Design an enzyme around this catalytic site. Structure first.
Site, PDB file in Angstrom:
ATOM      1  N   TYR A   1      54.782  71.703  40.256  1.00 37.85           N
ATOM      2  CA  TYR A   1      53.603  72.793  40.388  1.00 37.85           C
ATOM      3  C   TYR A   1      52.763  72.814  39.269  1.00 37.85           C
ATOM      4  O   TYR A   1      53.249  72.501  38.094  1.00 37.85           O
ATOM      5  CB  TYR A   1      53.902  74.210  40.891  1.00 37.85           C
ATOM      6  CG  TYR A   1      54.649  74.992  39.599  1.00 37.85           C
ATOM      7  CD1 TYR A   1      53.830  75.722  38.909  1.00 37.85           C
ATOM      8  CD2 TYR A   1      55.927  74.621  39.374  1.00 37.85           C
ATOM      9  CE1 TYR A   1      54.315  76.254  37.722  1.00 37.85           C
ATOM     10  CE2 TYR A   1      56.626  75.481  38.254  1.00 37.85           C
ATOM     11  CZ  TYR A   1      55.793  76.185  37.494  1.00 37.85           C
ATOM     12  OH  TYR A   1      56.050  76.819  36.252  1.00 37.85           O
TER      13      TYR A   1
ATOM     14  N   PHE B   1      47.772  77.951  32.045  1.00 44.70           N
ATOM     15  CA  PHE B   1      47.902  76.764  32.646  1.00 44.70           C
ATOM     16  C   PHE B   1      49.083  76.281  32.572  1.00 44.70           C
ATOM     17  O   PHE B   1      49.362  75.621  31.710  1.00 44.70           O
ATOM     18  CB  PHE B   1      46.644  75.806  32.438  1.00 44.70           C
ATOM     19  N   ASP B   2      49.893  76.395  33.614  1.00 48.34           N
ATOM     20  CA  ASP B   2      51.608  76.403  33.277  1.00 48.34           C
ATOM     21  C   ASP B   2      51.883  75.225  34.472  1.00 48.34           C
ATOM     22  O   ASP B   2      51.597  75.452  35.698  1.00 48.34           O
ATOM     23  CB  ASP B   2      52.340  77.558  33.564  1.00 48.34           C
ATOM     24  CG  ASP B   2      53.862  77.450  34.074  1.00 48.34           C
ATOM     25  OD1 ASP B   2      54.609  76.740  33.096  1.00 48.34           O
ATOM     26  OD2 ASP B   2      54.289  77.848  34.956  1.00 48.34           O
TER      27      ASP B   2
ATOM     28  N   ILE C   1      57.920  84.883  42.844  1.00 50.76           N
ATOM     29  CA  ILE C   1      56.974  85.716  43.455  1.00 50.76           C
ATOM     30  C   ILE C   1      56.772  85.677  45.006  1.00 50.76           C
ATOM     31  O   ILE C   1      56.979  84.559  45.647  1.00 50.76           O
ATOM     32  CB  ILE C   1      55.337  85.748  42.844  1.00 50.76           C
ATOM     33  CG1 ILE C   1      54.765  84.189  42.953  1.00 50.76           C
ATOM     34  CG2 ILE C   1      55.248  86.495  41.320  1.00 50.76           C
ATOM     35  CD1 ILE C   1      53.345  84.131  42.665  1.00 50.76           C
TER      36      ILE C   1
ATOM     37  N   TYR D   1      52.157  89.555  40.446  1.00 50.18           N
ATOM     38  CA  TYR D   1      52.625  90.474  39.481  1.00 50.18           C
ATOM     39  C   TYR D   1      52.063  92.025  39.430  1.00 50.18           C
ATOM     40  O   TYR D   1      52.668  92.713  38.543  1.00 50.18           O
ATOM     41  CB  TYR D   1      52.443  89.935  38.209  1.00 50.18           C
ATOM     42  CG  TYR D   1      53.421  88.632  38.046  1.00 50.18           C
ATOM     43  CD1 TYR D   1      54.791  88.717  37.842  1.00 50.18           C
ATOM     44  CD2 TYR D   1      52.684  87.416  38.046  1.00 50.18           C
ATOM     45  CE1 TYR D   1      55.660  87.438  37.673  1.00 50.18           C
ATOM     46  CE2 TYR D   1      53.622  86.498  38.049  1.00 50.18           C
ATOM     47  CZ  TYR D   1      54.918  86.256  38.046  1.00 50.18           C
ATOM     48  OH  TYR D   1      55.536  85.116  37.957  1.00 50.18           O
TER      49      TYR D   1
ATOM     50  N   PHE E   1      47.597  78.285  42.495  1.00 51.75           N
ATOM     51  CA  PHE E   1      48.807  77.184  42.191  1.00 51.75           C
ATOM     52  C   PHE E   1      48.278  76.052  43.192  1.00 51.75           C
ATOM     53  O   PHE E   1      47.865  76.059  44.374  1.00 51.75           O
ATOM     54  CB  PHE E   1      50.227  77.555  42.608  1.00 51.75           C
ATOM     55  CG  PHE E   1      50.897  78.614  41.849  1.00 51.75           C
ATOM     56  CD1 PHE E   1      50.519  79.708  41.993  1.00 51.75           C
ATOM     57  CD2 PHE E   1      51.640  78.277  40.907  1.00 51.75           C
ATOM     58  CE1 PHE E   1      50.850  80.992  41.499  1.00 51.75           C
ATOM     59  CE2 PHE E   1      52.168  79.402  39.978  1.00 51.75           C
ATOM     60  CZ  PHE E   1      51.854  80.541  40.408  1.00 51.75           C
TER      61      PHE E   1
HETATM   62  C1  LIG Z   1      56.209  85.922  34.626  1.00 50.27           C
HETATM   63  O1  LIG Z   1      56.911  84.799  33.826  1.00 50.27           O
HETATM   64  C2  LIG Z   1      56.512  83.433  34.042  1.00 50.27           C
HETATM   65  C3  LIG Z   1      55.533  83.178  34.939  1.00 50.27           C
HETATM   66  C4  LIG Z   1      55.365  81.650  34.980  1.00 50.27           C
HETATM   67  C5  LIG Z   1      56.007  80.713  34.572  1.00 50.27           C
HETATM   68  C6  LIG Z   1      57.003  81.126  33.574  1.00 50.27           C
HETATM   69  C7  LIG Z   1      57.065  82.361  33.471  1.00 50.27           C
HETATM   70  O2  LIG Z   1      58.185  82.922  32.484  1.00 50.27           O
HETATM   71  C8  LIG Z   1      57.854  83.952  31.525  1.00 50.27           C
HETATM   72  O3  LIG Z   1      57.706  80.357  32.862  1.00 50.27           O
HETATM   73  C9  LIG Z   1      57.738  78.717  33.099  1.00 50.27           C
HETATM   74  C10 LIG Z   1      58.749  78.169  32.726  1.00 50.27           C
HETATM   75  C11 LIG Z   1      59.483  77.947  33.872  1.00 50.27           C
HETATM   76  N1  LIG Z   1      60.047  79.018  35.037  1.00 50.27           N
HETATM   77  C12 LIG Z   1      59.244  79.605  35.969  1.00 50.27           C
HETATM   78  C13 LIG Z   1      60.097  80.458  36.359  1.00 50.27           C
HETATM   79  N2  LIG Z   1      61.258  80.567  35.396  1.00 50.27           N
HETATM   80  N3  LIG Z   1      60.980  79.735  34.590  1.00 50.27           N
HETATM   81  C14 LIG Z   1      60.021  81.228  37.482  1.00 50.27           C
HETATM   82  C15 LIG Z   1      59.375  82.707  36.741  1.00 50.27           C
HETATM   83  C16 LIG Z   1      60.497  83.607  36.485  1.00 50.27           C
HETATM   84  C17 LIG Z   1      58.487  83.533  37.797  1.00 50.27           C
HETATM   85  O4  LIG Z   1      57.420  82.504  38.172  1.00 50.27           O
HETATM   86  C18 LIG Z   1      56.952  82.722  39.588  1.00 50.27           C
HETATM   87  O5  LIG Z   1      57.251  83.317  40.384  1.00 50.27           O
HETATM   88  C19 LIG Z   1      55.856  81.715  39.648  1.00 50.27           C
HETATM   89  C20 LIG Z   1      56.157  80.684  40.833  1.00 50.27           C
HETATM   90  C21 LIG Z   1      57.057  79.786  40.305  1.00 50.27           C
HETATM   91  C22 LIG Z   1      56.417  79.092  39.038  1.00 50.27           C
HETATM   92  C23 LIG Z   1      56.224  80.180  37.832  1.00 50.27           C
HETATM   93  N4  LIG Z   1      55.429  81.141  38.459  1.00 50.27           N
HETATM   94  C24 LIG Z   1      54.466  81.966  37.510  1.00 50.27           C
HETATM   95  O6  LIG Z   1      54.066  83.204  37.826  1.00 50.27           O
HETATM   96  C25 LIG Z   1      54.180  81.339  36.153  1.00 50.27           C
HETATM   97  C26 LIG Z   1      52.512  81.617  35.823  1.00 50.27           C
HETATM   98  C27 LIG Z   1      51.746  80.748  36.657  1.00 50.27           C
HETATM   99  C28 LIG Z   1      50.150  81.424  36.350  1.00 50.27           C
HETATM  100  C29 LIG Z   1      50.006  80.998  34.823  1.00 50.27           C
HETATM  101  C30 LIG Z   1      50.996  81.556  33.793  1.00 50.27           C
HETATM  102  C31 LIG Z   1      52.619  81.222  34.287  1.00 50.27           C
END
Ligand SMILES: COc1cc2cc(c1OC)OCCCn1cc(nn1)C[C@H](C)COC(=O)[C@@H]1CCCCN1C(=O)[C@H]2C1CCCCC1
Length: 128
Positions: free
Chosen positions: A45, A55-56, A75, A101, A118
């Site tokens: 992703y 931008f992750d 989410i 969120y 995404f």
């Molecule tokens: C709110 O916290 C983060 C949100 C997001 C990424 C995060 C977060 O960690 C503080 O770290 C990236 C490290 C890999 N990873 C992803 C996850 N666990 N580890 C799932 C997360 C615990 C929850 O993420 C999600 O539900 C979604 C879909 C799966 C991919 C990550 N997601 C995010 O919301 C990202 C977010 C995307 C928008 C830009 C900022 C980061």
């Protein structure tokens, strides 16, 4: 660019038809199965605030992002969107805060009331 295109052209895949999760298929996948609740799912992703200011990406960790569908490990918008995807598909999602969120947010990464974008590639899924 991409997020505005999803606003303009994406399909509303919410049950409530509240435009909370909007989708475009960018690259078509293979086969008839789509994941179901319980499946172990493997994706690559690229995410960002739709504003564009964070931008992750799974690629930043040089490995696929793995999770169990509908187990509240991601989410609500991913549980809903990835359930619609075929193996090999690349899709764009645009997500209102209700399916991400919320007004609480998740600081410091995510502010209150954030819309998210995404690109997801579905690599594989396997049944619990
Ligand atoms: C709110 O916290 C983060 C949100 C997001 C990424 C995060 C977060 O960690 C503080 O770290 C990236 C490290 C890999 N990873 C992803 C996850 N666990 N580890 C799932 C997360 C615990 C929850 O993420 C999600 O539900 C979604 C879909 C799966 C991919 C990550 N997601 C995010 O919301 C990202 C977010 C995307 C928008 C830009 C900022 C980061």
């Amino acid at each position: 660019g991409a997020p505005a295109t999803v606003t303009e052209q994406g399909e509303d895949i919410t049950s409530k038809k509240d435009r909370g999760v909007l989708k475009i298929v960018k690259r078509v996948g293979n086969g008839e199965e789509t994941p179901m609740i319980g499946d172990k799912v493997y994706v690559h992703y690229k995410g960002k605030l739709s504003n564009g200011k964070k931008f992750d990406s799974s690629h930043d960790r040089n490995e696929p992002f793995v999770f169990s569908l509908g187990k509240g490990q991601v989410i609500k918008a991913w549980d809903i969107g990835v359930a619609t995807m075929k193996k090999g598909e690349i899709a764009h999602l645009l997500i209102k805060p209700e399916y991400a969120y919320g007004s609480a947010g998740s600081l410091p990464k995510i502010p209150s009331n954030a819309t998210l974008f995404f690109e997801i590639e579905l690599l594989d899924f396997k049944g619990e």
